[PDB]
Write a protein that binds this DNA or RNA. Structure first.
Lengths: 90, 73, 69, 102, 95, 77, 102, 90, 77, 95, 96, 78, 103, 89
DNA sequence: ATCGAGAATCCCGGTGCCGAGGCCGCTCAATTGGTCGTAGACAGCTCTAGCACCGCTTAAACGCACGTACGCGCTGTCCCCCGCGTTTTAACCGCCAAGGGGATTACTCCCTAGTCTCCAGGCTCGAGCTCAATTGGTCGTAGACAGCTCTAGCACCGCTTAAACGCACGTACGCGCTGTCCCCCGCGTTTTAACCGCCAAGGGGATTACTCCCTAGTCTCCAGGCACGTGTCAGATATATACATCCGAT
DNA sequence: ATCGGATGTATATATCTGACACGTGCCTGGAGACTAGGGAGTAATCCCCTTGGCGGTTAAAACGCGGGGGACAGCGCGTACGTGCGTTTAAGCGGTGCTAGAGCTGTCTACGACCAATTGAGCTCGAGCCTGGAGACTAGGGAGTAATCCCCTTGGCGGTTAAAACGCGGGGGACAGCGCGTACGTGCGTTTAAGCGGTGCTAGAGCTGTCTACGACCAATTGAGCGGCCTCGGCACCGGGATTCTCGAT
């Protein structure tokens, strides 16, 4: 059974090196990741459909992020994602 | 439609301007916006009225609107 | 420009909602509520427009915005 | 791994597989799962950051659901995102309406 | 000794907003759940975590609903919630 | 008559978490009705999903999907 | 003429010639074209009788293809004989399935 | 010069319906019919004669062929008509 | 003699046709259908027999009948 | 031991489509042929191969008719052939 | 305003078109179809008018009969709407 | 694409004459395919006769003969 | 030297020719007509016998029996069309069960 | 009493040298050959009559084959017939 | 309301250990790179349209004095009715005991393929005939040669009649569920057809005397077919009349 | 299900005219005696075996007789698909006005195929060989059927933290009751704008080319995840303080 637990735990060590997390909390984090995954991917699919495009690219993901996230959360997520895609392309 | 056309159009253009420059609008986009705003206000006023009657009043007040909007989320 | 939604217009909307009497302070509140709603909807609509690489907000964008809230 | 090439912690390959098998679209761009993984990672990091903050305020080194509820509800934008979301065993924030106090 | 009306209610408020434990008894709720499910399809079984999930959902729904009822009560310059408060809260929610 | 297991003191505790200090005697029965309606609606959808999957065991995912599709997404299961 | 000797209206001589030239057999008996003319005459008479009757039911004095189709399909044995035959401009018999009615 | 059965069909019509006429299309259908039945009867009679190693088609082959081709009560009347006609002719 | 076409024979015929389940009313119905077929074929067959001034219906006559009813038979030429 | 309804039916379908032997008993068919023939012409005799020809033709006709009947039954989302299926098959065949 | 219930006008049309005999497919488009199909067999062919009219009579008679059989198949399945499976059953039993 | 000349209302009229009360949307395309096959089969035979007679004009008799040899004998065009 | 040998055929050109003369088909028969007809008949016989032999070999029999003829004819679309209204004596039917009847 | 048995057997020996044929199967082959003969001769006869022609030629046979045989069977039969007439000529 | 005393309720601090968490490790399987193409997916260009920008107009919308009766917030009393302590009562939790499936495993039985033995069934060797090849003269049937005159095809133009495109929206298909029925599987029964034998002649199947039925060629005399002037039921224009059919209302 | 009114339909009816029978002139191929020619079906006659009728036997199957399950006729509800309506547009159609390929017929002529001997040759039936698929058996695999399994179900009662409930009692909430003030019309001036025009223009929806990127296999794989074990942070309990209400007073 796959989950995001280990990646969440590594992130926890990045943000709080000496802090742990309970099993229930890790389950809540995994639920969270799946919800946001579904919301963004589904909305991006809808954008692509709306524009008669058959491919979901980083642009639909970016626009979905702008629709779903509030204010500074959307801008910060877009900045991180953009840096990541440009670094990947290099 | 119950709001006058031209002031709503002007409001739409003013509000739209602080997000992206040089926009134009299709006519049917503005009528769609008018249908949406007026439907929302009619429904919101319905909720305000239920909140007012709950408080044994017949006069709507700002506090009724804020309660309706808070419960709506 | 928010002042273009006049007092009698808000009165007509209140009558359609079945409201018989309206406090003088309602009007500014309604204007504020309207501004917030409009801002939110148009933000989504224009976001969709930019995705389509268009400069014209279309009726489908607005309807789509309405659907997603 | 593609995650290392993209500088991310969330698994881009895994996200890509779930996008492929979730019947979301006929074709998938190479950047979409990278972006998606990055966004999920960012939001996870923010919630864990605030929940950790709450945990230290309560002098607890382990995050429990209560800290998640405090973190989410005390932040307006996270509260908006999870406005219709139930955090199991989260409880509620202490809050008594002023008119009720003696 | 006697506490005045309201003091113990508030003390209870402080206690239950501080904690997270489930507030309905497990087993009677379980019987309720099995009865309702049985009235749709006979002889069903349930995993334990399904009942725990249903209980979390019901209690979260009720606590939130009681929050809205309280807002409606305070709106009417009352401090006691009554059925009309529930009716108003659910009508405005759209239920 | 299993609805009576949601006792008067349990409803009192639930109201307390909502910040309620005083409760009219008629709330509890009203609350009971309301709760029952909610449960039917959730369980109905859950069972529908179970039936689509040709299963005889309602799973946690069935319930989560029911809540999601009624706009009451639940975290943790 | 042989038709008069046999009491027929259809041309026995012509039918005989058609038998001779239809490459059916090297020889054709003397009674065969008389018999054929009689059979053709009888069947023609039956169809024309019934079709005329149908024409009169429709208050028409001239037989048109509709009356021939009605005549043929409304007679079990003629319908059997012409089971795989298309009557040009015939249409079909009026018939609505009971299950289709209100 | 194109031969047809039009006048004979018309004489029969006047025998059976003295005051009734017939359209050109209907006369064409009667002619097609007569040719069809002609072909059927003659073909069955030819086959009958062959089957029996006979080189002559007589009224007997025609009568049996008629019995094969025409249904029931129609067949009895046709056989009756043919027999009366052949006996009067002889 | 129609009852001599027994129930198990009709079931076997249906089995060759791929039929798995058979209503009780098929058998009498099938018998009626069978009777009609035989009558028709034999009517032509006996005519051929009568045409040859014979008293024995031969296999060839039946084959000819089948051919002329659109049911051509191989193997008895 | 007992096979479930249908298993043995399928076994018989495979069995009889694999083989070619005639499926109606010789003597009752012969009796039927003579009975029917007697009502058309007196004093008739029959060659053995004439009766065998009749058996092959009748059985081929019935198997084909049962095939069509089965297709008509299946069209109506059934697996059991019924008289209405036979009459529909025969009507569409033109009998 | 007045509105007939679903089926009344269908039945009326059935009575109307079973009463009359005129061809129901448009002459010229059908003619174009015939010429196209024939041209895909031999180029530069011509047609007599009565040949096309003959083709029209044959096609309409075949389809009307086929639709009769489809309707009988529909009734067998306790339906009133003809479906592709009805056409396929009718043509399978006919032997086409 | 002349097969599209067999219009939707034409198929409805044919079905009405056939006694059909309700018609699925997919019938029409299906019917068109069936019609095309029929015409092909008929026209094929017709063209053979036309080619056999060393003529360049398909006649009414060619079609009547094609129909007869296909078991769909047509009266009235002899 | 026979004409069938000159035509490269096995079927009897002479016999088919005589059968055409005596079948009351036409007053005259051209010399090439029975050759063509015999060739067509031989082709079709060879095609059916080819398939029937194949079916016989699948069944490990050295003699072709009617069952193999039925399999050969009904499993080949064009032969089945040609013999759509033909009964092969002692042929049986093809094994075939509609999917809805299987468990 | 004539039959095609020896010619069917010769064809069988051409296509399957070590394969035989039962009496019933050979009878079925004779029925088949007679059937196709009758079909082709009859169609050719009708073609000749339709065209007011008194002679059945290889062309009448060929057109009849095109009318009666489907697709590949028709093409191959015409090919075999044409080859045979050219070899005979 | 703000001292002051006093108790309850909770908070804090200190500790016990254990189990939920952290962490390694073997693997194994979900993950990643090497190579092919098929494009889908985007870049360039273009006609269009509808969308922005601007002047009267008159008129309806709005905006502004006026005053006023209609609430609404603010106190007062009552009574009313629901929470807290104390107590009793107890199902619920503890916490356990036993029965208990969904399942493929682990067995079991019958179906469906491999393996010798023995023929009826074709497989070869010789015997006298009906079918097949030749050319010849001898007809005819069919195939070029040449019209030629028509009708099948090519383009113009109303126009309307039908075809195409939405537009409610309501019956139709369909689909899961369900009670009874009714028919397939299994087995004893009790036939009764399959296998086998007997005798025979009635009719199939040839064999021939024959005579009479129908072809074949010719001719006299013809009805049936090709043109062809013309009132007519037929086709098309208005009508009223029920004739149905759709929406209240028994 | 009907009793009626409101419309949209064919029906029963009256009128005008028009290609269509249709009756007519007449013109020619086809026809039917005719007398034989001869050649075929008819009618004894006669023989040989095929199909019966029947005696006769047996064991395969038919035929009842139950059991049970699984199938079919319903049915109530979902959703949704095609329909009848109306409006707007597209092309079929009746009317030209042509026009040249090819159906139709007429010459004629020259191949081509057929009885007629006629010359002969594969074909077909005995007759006697074998030997290959029935058959008669065997063995392993097809499946069905219980049926233990560890893990989750169902039932179950002792002690005990939780649920009643009852009396009290003391604070809400509800209605009365009012006084002020403030929105709601109410009427008059304005002023802003829908709408009618008109202008130019940007972008957008579409069309075409094409190529960069992602799908999409395989083989190679190392990181995640169960499995297990090591561990110390904090859930829970004992002992003592902060705070925290709570009554009296004035």
């Amino acid at each position: 059974k796959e989950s995001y637990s280990i990646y969440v735990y590594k992130v926890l060590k990045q943000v709080h090196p000496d802090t742990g997390i309970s099993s229930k909390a890790m389950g809540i984090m995994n639920s969270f990741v799946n919800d946001i995954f579904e919301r963004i991917a589904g909305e991006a699919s809808r954008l692509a459909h709306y524009n008669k495009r058959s491919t979901i690219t980083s642009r639909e993901i970016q626009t979905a992020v702008r629709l779903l996230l509030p204010g500074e959360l959307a801008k910060h997520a877009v900045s991180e994602g953009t840096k990541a895609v440009t670094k990947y392309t290099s | 439609l119950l709001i006058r056309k031209l002031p709503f159009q002007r409001l739409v253009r003013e509000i739209a301007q602080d997000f992206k420059t040089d926009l134009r609008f299709q006519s049917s986009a503005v009528m769609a916006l008018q249908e949406a705003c007026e439907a929302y206000l009619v429904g919101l006023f319905e909720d305000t009225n239920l909140c007012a009657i709950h408080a044994k009043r017949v006069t709507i007040m700002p506090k009724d609107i804020q309660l309706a909007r808070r419960i709506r989320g | 420009n928010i002042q273009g939604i006049t007092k009698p217009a808000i009165r007509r909307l209140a009558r359609r909602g079945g409201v018989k009497r309206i406090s003088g302070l309602i009007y500014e509140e309604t204007r504020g509520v309207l501004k917030v709603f409009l801002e939110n909807v148009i933000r989504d609509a224009v976001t969709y427009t930019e995705h389509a690489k268009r400069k014209t907000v279309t009726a489908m964008d607005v309807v789509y915005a309405l659907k997603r809230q | 791994t593609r995650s290392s090439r993209a500088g991310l912690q969330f698994p881009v390959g895994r996200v890509h597989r779930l996008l492929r098998k979730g019947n979301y679209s006929e074709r998938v761009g190479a950047g979409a799962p990278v972006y998606l993984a990055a966004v999920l990672e960012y939001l996870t990091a923010e919630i864990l950051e605030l929940a950790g903050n709450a945990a230290r305020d309560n002098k607890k080194t382990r995050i429990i659901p209560r800290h998640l509820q405090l973190a989410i509800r005390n932040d307006e934008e996270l509260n908006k995102l999870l406005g219709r979301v139930t955090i199991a065993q989260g409880g509620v924030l202490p809050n008594i309406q002023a008119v009720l106090l003696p | 000794h006697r506490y005045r009306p309201g003091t113990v209610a508030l003390r209870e408020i402080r206690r239950y907003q501080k904690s997270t434990e489930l507030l309905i008894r497990k087993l009677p709720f379980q019987r309720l759940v099995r009865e309702i499910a049985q009235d749709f399809k006979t002889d069903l079984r349930f995993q334990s975590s399904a009942v725990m999930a249903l209980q979390e959902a019901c209690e979260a729904y009720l606590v939130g609903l009681f929050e809205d009822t309280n807002l409606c009560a305070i709106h009417a310059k009352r401090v006691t919630i009554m059925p009309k408060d529930i009716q108003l809260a659910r009508r405005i929610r759209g239920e």
